[PDB]
Design an enzyme around this catalytic site. Sequence first.
Site, PDB file in Angstrom:
ATOM      1  N   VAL A   1       3.265 -24.160 -18.362  1.00 25.26           N
ATOM      2  CA  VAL A   1       4.336 -23.898 -17.408  1.00 25.26           C
ATOM      3  C   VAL A   1       3.833 -23.764 -15.973  1.00 25.26           C
ATOM      4  O   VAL A   1       4.626 -23.937 -15.035  1.00 25.26           O
ATOM      5  CB  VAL A   1       5.130 -22.639 -17.812  1.00 25.26           C
ATOM      6  CG1 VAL A   1       5.945 -22.910 -19.068  1.00 25.26           C
ATOM      7  CG2 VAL A   1       4.187 -21.468 -18.029  1.00 25.26           C
TER       8      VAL A   1
ATOM      9  N   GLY B   1      -2.780 -24.105 -11.272  1.00 25.49           N
ATOM     10  CA  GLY B   1      -3.195 -23.846  -9.908  1.00 25.49           C
ATOM     11  C   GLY B   1      -4.657 -23.465  -9.852  1.00 25.49           C
ATOM     12  O   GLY B   1      -5.400 -23.622 -10.824  1.00 25.49           O
TER      13      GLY B   1
ATOM     14  N   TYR C   1      -5.898 -20.440  -9.641  1.00 27.62           N
ATOM     15  CA  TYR C   1      -6.144 -19.319 -10.544  1.00 27.62           C
ATOM     16  C   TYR C   1      -6.589 -19.796 -11.920  1.00 27.62           C
ATOM     17  O   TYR C   1      -7.506 -19.225 -12.522  1.00 27.62           O
ATOM     18  CB  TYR C   1      -4.878 -18.469 -10.666  1.00 27.62           C
ATOM     19  CG  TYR C   1      -3.686 -19.247 -11.184  1.00 27.62           C
ATOM     20  CD1 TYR C   1      -2.890 -19.992 -10.324  1.00 27.62           C
ATOM     21  CD2 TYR C   1      -3.363 -19.243 -12.536  1.00 27.62           C
ATOM     22  CE1 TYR C   1      -1.805 -20.707 -10.793  1.00 27.62           C
ATOM     23  CE2 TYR C   1      -2.280 -19.957 -13.015  1.00 27.62           C
ATOM     24  CZ  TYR C   1      -1.504 -20.687 -12.139  1.00 27.62           C
ATOM     25  OH  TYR C   1      -0.423 -21.399 -12.610  1.00 27.62           O
ATOM     26  N   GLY C   2      -5.951 -20.843 -12.431  1.00 30.84           N
ATOM     27  CA  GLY C   2      -6.182 -21.313 -13.780  1.00 30.84           C
ATOM     28  C   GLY C   2      -4.946 -22.001 -14.318  1.00 30.84           C
ATOM     29  O   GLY C   2      -4.450 -22.955 -13.712  1.00 30.84           O
ATOM     30  N   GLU C   3      -4.427 -21.521 -15.445  1.00 30.35           N
ATOM     31  CA  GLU C   3      -3.203 -22.071 -16.006  1.00 30.35           C
ATOM     32  C   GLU C   3      -2.443 -20.969 -16.725  1.00 30.35           C
ATOM     33  O   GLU C   3      -3.033 -19.994 -17.200  1.00 30.35           O
ATOM     34  CB  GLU C   3      -3.492 -23.231 -16.968  1.00 30.35           C
TER      35      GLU C   3
ATOM     36  N   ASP D   1      -0.028 -10.287  -2.852  1.00 27.30           N
ATOM     37  CA  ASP D   1       0.392 -11.679  -2.953  1.00 27.30           C
ATOM     38  C   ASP D   1       1.859 -11.754  -3.361  1.00 27.30           C
ATOM     39  O   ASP D   1       2.265 -12.632  -4.131  1.00 27.30           O
ATOM     40  CB  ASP D   1      -0.486 -12.460  -3.934  1.00 27.30           C
ATOM     41  CG  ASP D   1      -0.439 -13.956  -3.689  1.00 27.30           C
ATOM     42  OD1 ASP D   1       0.062 -14.369  -2.624  1.00 27.30           O
ATOM     43  OD2 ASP D   1      -0.899 -14.723  -4.560  1.00 27.30           O
TER      44      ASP D   1
HETATM   45  C1  LIG Z   1       0.460 -14.177 -18.589  1.00 26.01           C
HETATM   46  O1  LIG Z   1       0.412 -13.760 -17.223  1.00 26.01           O
HETATM   47  C2  LIG Z   1       1.480 -14.269 -16.389  1.00 26.01           C
HETATM   48  C3  LIG Z   1       2.637 -14.824 -16.960  1.00 26.01           C
HETATM   49  C4  LIG Z   1       3.665 -15.332 -16.130  1.00 26.01           C
HETATM   50  C5  LIG Z   1       4.858 -15.887 -16.682  1.00 26.01           C
HETATM   51  C6  LIG Z   1       5.531 -15.165 -17.649  1.00 26.01           C
HETATM   52  N1  LIG Z   1       6.665 -15.590 -18.214  1.00 26.01           N
HETATM   53  C7  LIG Z   1       7.206 -16.758 -17.863  1.00 26.01           C
HETATM   54  C8  LIG Z   1       6.622 -17.557 -16.910  1.00 26.01           C
HETATM   55  C9  LIG Z   1       7.274 -18.786 -16.584  1.00 26.01           C
HETATM   56  C10 LIG Z   1       7.742 -19.655 -17.585  1.00 26.01           C
HETATM   57  C11 LIG Z   1       8.390 -20.862 -17.227  1.00 26.01           C
HETATM   58  C12 LIG Z   1       8.576 -21.185 -15.879  1.00 26.01           C
HETATM   59  N2  LIG Z   1       9.259 -22.447 -15.482  1.00 26.01           N
HETATM   60  C13 LIG Z   1       8.526 -23.517 -14.729  1.00 26.01           C
HETATM   61  C14 LIG Z   1       9.486 -24.479 -14.019  1.00 26.01           C
HETATM   62  N3  LIG Z   1      10.427 -25.061 -14.907  1.00 26.01           N
HETATM   63  C15 LIG Z   1      11.146 -24.091 -15.666  1.00 26.01           C
HETATM   64  C16 LIG Z   1      10.219 -23.118 -16.406  1.00 26.01           C
HETATM   65  C17 LIG Z   1       8.123 -20.309 -14.877  1.00 26.01           C
HETATM   66  C18 LIG Z   1       7.491 -19.112 -15.235  1.00 26.01           C
HETATM   67  C19 LIG Z   1       5.407 -17.129 -16.294  1.00 26.01           C
HETATM   68  C20 LIG Z   1       4.713 -17.975 -15.242  1.00 26.01           C
HETATM   69  C21 LIG Z   1       3.532 -15.233 -14.735  1.00 26.01           C
HETATM   70  C22 LIG Z   1       2.376 -14.683 -14.164  1.00 26.01           C
HETATM   71  C23 LIG Z   1       1.343 -14.201 -14.995  1.00 26.01           C
HETATM   72  C24 LIG Z   1       0.085 -13.584 -14.379  1.00 26.01           C
HETATM   73  N4  LIG Z   1      -0.750 -12.711 -15.172  1.00 26.01           N
HETATM   74  O2  LIG Z   1      -0.200 -13.807 -13.260  1.00 26.01           O
END
Ligand SMILES: COc1cc(-c2cncc(-c3ccc(N4CCNCC4)cc3)c2C)ccc1C(N)=O
EC number: 2.7.11.30
Length: 292
Positions: A11, A14, A16-18, A133
């Site tokens: 999802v 960058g 940071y990683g993935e 951030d």
């Molecule tokens: C594990 O850790 C982190 C997790 C998240 C994070 C948690 N649940 C959901 C999302 C997420 C899922 C899908 C999308 N969409 C992309 C565009 N199209 C639609 C779907 C966006 C976000 C994320 C990223 C975030 C940050 C961290 C961290 N530790 O920095």
Amino acid sequence: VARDITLLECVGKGRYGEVWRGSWQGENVAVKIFSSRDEKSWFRETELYNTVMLRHENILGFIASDMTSRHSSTQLWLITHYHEMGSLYDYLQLTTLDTVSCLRIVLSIASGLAHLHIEIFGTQGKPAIAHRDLKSKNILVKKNGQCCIADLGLAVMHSQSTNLDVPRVGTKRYMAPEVLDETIQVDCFDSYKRVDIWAFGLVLWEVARRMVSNGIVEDYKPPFYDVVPNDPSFEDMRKVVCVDQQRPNIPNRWFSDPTLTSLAKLMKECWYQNPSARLTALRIKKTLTKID
Ligand SMILES: COc1cc(-c2cncc(-c3ccc(N4CCNCC4)cc3)c2C)ccc1C(N)=O
């Protein structure tokens, strides 16, 4: 361990990683895979969840952290709850808002930010934490209409004891004037709290544009969309914020709505060139709680 996890879909990617959506015992989970160049960001974000026991309805919920390291390779995973609706940045582009949904978003963020900022004492206390951030892409929208703050890999801590940074490691679009100026008092922890308030002010602007009122709304746009190019440089931001002293423009429609007018005054009070003049996370929460 988290070796029982199925990585389904990527999802986010960058420096940071993935971040992957994964399944674990029938439940969706988010998995952050840190490249070996971010190992200290992994440990820091883990230590906040692992040792400080960071938990709050508006902070991303920790599940597990795993590191396995041989001479061959090293893997760094941070596992948290998953939020299907994605980031506040993705959400705002596909959705408009009303009085109630907008407030829930805004007040939700202020609540998570203030819990981060406020120090707690005792056996279950926590040090004061600065995010560093804050931005729409690091805030997740929950199914219930609230948000939670996510990426803590750059956070700093301050407790009642002598002691966490060098300089300016945040997203430049959201950097406060004292960072672009280099006027920031790097030796005063409150300096970093006031940087967050500046970023929070930009996020308020982002959200407010999407609240419909009197049949009108604003397309989503990033802060400073009209005066800086995509991926602005450090010098571009300094020119807009410090030299030109620009601030996001307030549409005239906001003043024909009570909610939007209150938000407008909140934003502006997050944008004073003087950091000491900016509101605190707590007072932003209080003000937001009194609206409607
Ligand atoms: C594990 O850790 C982190 C997790 C998240 C994070 C948690 N649940 C959901 C999302 C997420 C899922 C899908 C999308 N969409 C992309 C565009 N199209 C639609 C779907 C966006 C976000 C994320 C990223 C975030 C940050 C961290 C961290 N530790 O920095």
